[PDB]
Design a protein around this motif. Sequence first.
Motif, PDB file in Angstrom:
ATOM      1  N   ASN A 264       0.843  -1.193   0.000  1.00  6.95           N
ATOM      2  CA  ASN A 264       0.000   0.000   0.000  1.00  6.95           C
ATOM      3  C   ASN A 264       0.878   1.243   0.000  1.00  6.95           C
ATOM      4  O   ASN A 264       1.004   1.931   1.025  1.00  6.95           O
ATOM      5  CB  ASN A 264      -0.958   0.017   1.185  1.00  6.95           C
ATOM      6  CG  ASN A 264      -1.994   1.108   1.059  1.00  6.95           C
ATOM      7  OD1 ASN A 264      -2.136   1.704  -0.005  1.00  6.95           O
ATOM      8  ND2 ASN A 264      -2.727   1.377   2.137  1.00  6.95           N
ATOM      9  N   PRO A 265       1.482   1.580  -1.142  1.00  4.67           N
ATOM     10  CA  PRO A 265       2.372   2.750  -1.192  1.00  4.67           C
ATOM     11  C   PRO A 265       1.692   4.078  -0.893  1.00  4.67           C
ATOM     12  O   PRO A 265       2.405   5.079  -0.739  1.00  4.67           O
ATOM     13  CB  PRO A 265       2.910   2.717  -2.631  1.00  4.67           C
ATOM     14  CG  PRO A 265       1.931   1.873  -3.387  1.00  4.67           C
ATOM     15  CD  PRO A 265       1.466   0.846  -2.416  1.00  4.67           C
ATOM     16  N   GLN A 266       0.356   4.133  -0.808  1.00  3.94           N
ATOM     17  CA  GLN A 266      -0.301   5.399  -0.470  1.00  3.94           C
ATOM     18  C   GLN A 266      -0.076   5.763   0.990  1.00  3.94           C
ATOM     19  O   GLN A 266      -0.123   6.946   1.348  1.00  3.94           O
ATOM     20  CB  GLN A 266      -1.798   5.333  -0.790  1.00  3.94           C
ATOM     21  N   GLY A 267       0.192   4.768   1.837  1.00  8.24           N
ATOM     22  CA  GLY A 267       0.555   5.020   3.215  1.00  8.24           C
ATOM     23  C   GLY A 267       2.048   5.143   3.463  1.00  8.24           C
ATOM     24  O   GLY A 267       2.537   4.659   4.486  1.00  8.24           O
ATOM     25  N   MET A 268       2.787   5.784   2.553  1.00  8.77           N
ATOM     26  CA  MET A 268       4.223   5.967   2.719  1.00  8.77           C
ATOM     27  C   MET A 268       4.620   7.370   2.262  1.00  8.77           C
ATOM     28  O   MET A 268       3.935   8.015   1.458  1.00  8.77           O
ATOM     29  CB  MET A 268       5.043   4.917   1.944  1.00  8.77           C
ATOM     30  CG  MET A 268       4.523   3.484   2.031  1.00  8.77           C
ATOM     31  SD  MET A 268       5.482   2.297   1.045  1.00  8.77           S
ATOM     32  CE  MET A 268       5.040   0.756   1.823  1.00  8.77           C
ATOM     33  N   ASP A 269       5.761   7.819   2.761  1.00  3.73           N
ATOM     34  CA  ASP A 269       6.145   9.221   2.686  1.00  3.73           C
ATOM     35  C   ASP A 269       6.936   9.487   1.415  1.00  3.73           C
ATOM     36  O   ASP A 269       7.901   8.780   1.128  1.00  3.73           O
ATOM     37  CB  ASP A 269       6.961   9.561   3.927  1.00  3.73           C
ATOM     38  CG  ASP A 269       6.179   9.299   5.201  1.00  3.73           C
ATOM     39  OD1 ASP A 269       4.924   9.297   5.133  1.00  3.73           O
ATOM     40  OD2 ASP A 269       6.806   9.032   6.251  1.00  3.73           O
TER      41      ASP A 269
END
Length: 188
Positions: free
Chosen positions: A162-167
């Motif tokens: 889930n790359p949407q939860g990464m900075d």
Amino acid sequence: AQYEDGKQYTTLEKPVAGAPQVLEFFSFFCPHCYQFEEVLHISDNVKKKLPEGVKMTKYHVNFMGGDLGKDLTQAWAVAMALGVEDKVTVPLFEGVQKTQTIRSASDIRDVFINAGIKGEEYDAAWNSFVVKSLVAQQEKAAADVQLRGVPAMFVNGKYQLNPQGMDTSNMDVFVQQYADTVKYLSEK
Ligand SMILES: COc1cccc(-c2ccc3c(CC(=O)O)c(-c4cccc(OC)c4)oc3c2)c1
């Protein structure tokens, strides 16, 4: 916890039995896939954080680019059959997205000729039943997880990144978070 289902990753409601350990889907029409491969080098930073000799699998998908997208999946099968992924990944991305000179199956083939694959070798692989089953395998893998978006990575048929939860303020931090999560997931 520091890694939680729903944040760095999601967990598949219908697990996929006997799936490849690290399974990555992409499209040569996908702008984020261009980034993951050309700018961020996700696949390669992941491999560097896994146990040596683990199985990373990457498959092309059909649902982008219509006719040419399906052509690209067969050429990714050719690439895989001949083991030339490292020779054509960059020219293919750039031909589709940078120069936009890949407009037909013939243009895909030109990338391979230019990359140094003999015409006879390409055409023979392109038309082979080994490549046809390898197209089928890519499609089946995508179907198993009901894949509607790329880029995408799955660990052991259970966990999806889930790359949407990464900075994303820093390209390197983002990549390492991504690779560290894959590593954490593969140890679960
Ligand atoms: C900092 O360095 C760079 C340089 C170039 C790009 C990026 C970058 C930044 C954010 C995202 C996101 C999601 C979000 O909006 O958080 C996705 C993504 C991945 C898979 C499927 C998907 O579809 C739902 C979306 O890919 C991203 C790439 C970062």
